[PDB]
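It would be a great kindness if you could assist me with a short task in structural biology. The matter concerns a single protein, recorded as an amino acid sequence and a row of backbone structure tokens. Kindly check, if you would, that the fold set down in the tokens agrees with what the sequence suggests. Thank you for your consideration; the sequence and its tokens are set out here:
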Amino acid sequence: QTFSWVGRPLPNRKQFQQMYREICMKINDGSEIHIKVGQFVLIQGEDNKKPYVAKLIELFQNGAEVPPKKCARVQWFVRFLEIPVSKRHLLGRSPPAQEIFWYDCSDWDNKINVETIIGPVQVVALAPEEVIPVDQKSEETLFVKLSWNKKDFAPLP
């Protein structure tokens, strides 16, 4: 697949970087998939595993790499099984496959190469009372109720 910027560079005073609102991912079957800042994406992992989930917070052309690269800054989410086995019990319940967690930690480098993006995903914020359908296979829509900070789960504000 190939990527191209959509629109003009956004205003800023960053040296050697150009920021954009939107990118166009042209995939193998010919489709042109538009992804905007603020949307969520699936990100390719180590090939044995489910893709990571992240919110796009910035898109930028990075000239301080050679050759230059199209990049994104993201807000990470984490899937239940991406949380260490020894800490998962702290949730106090077994979440459905569709539930993910806002990753509240600066640990994971938040800059990625756009070439690692698989595509968009819908993510919906829920109140704790709300019910996720719990027998479902499809992950077309993921849901988030809580954050995880490496220590414990906390409700989103």
Q: What stands out?
A: Residues 96 and 132 are 8 Å apart (CA to CA). The longest strand covers residues 52-62. The chain has one domain: 1-157.
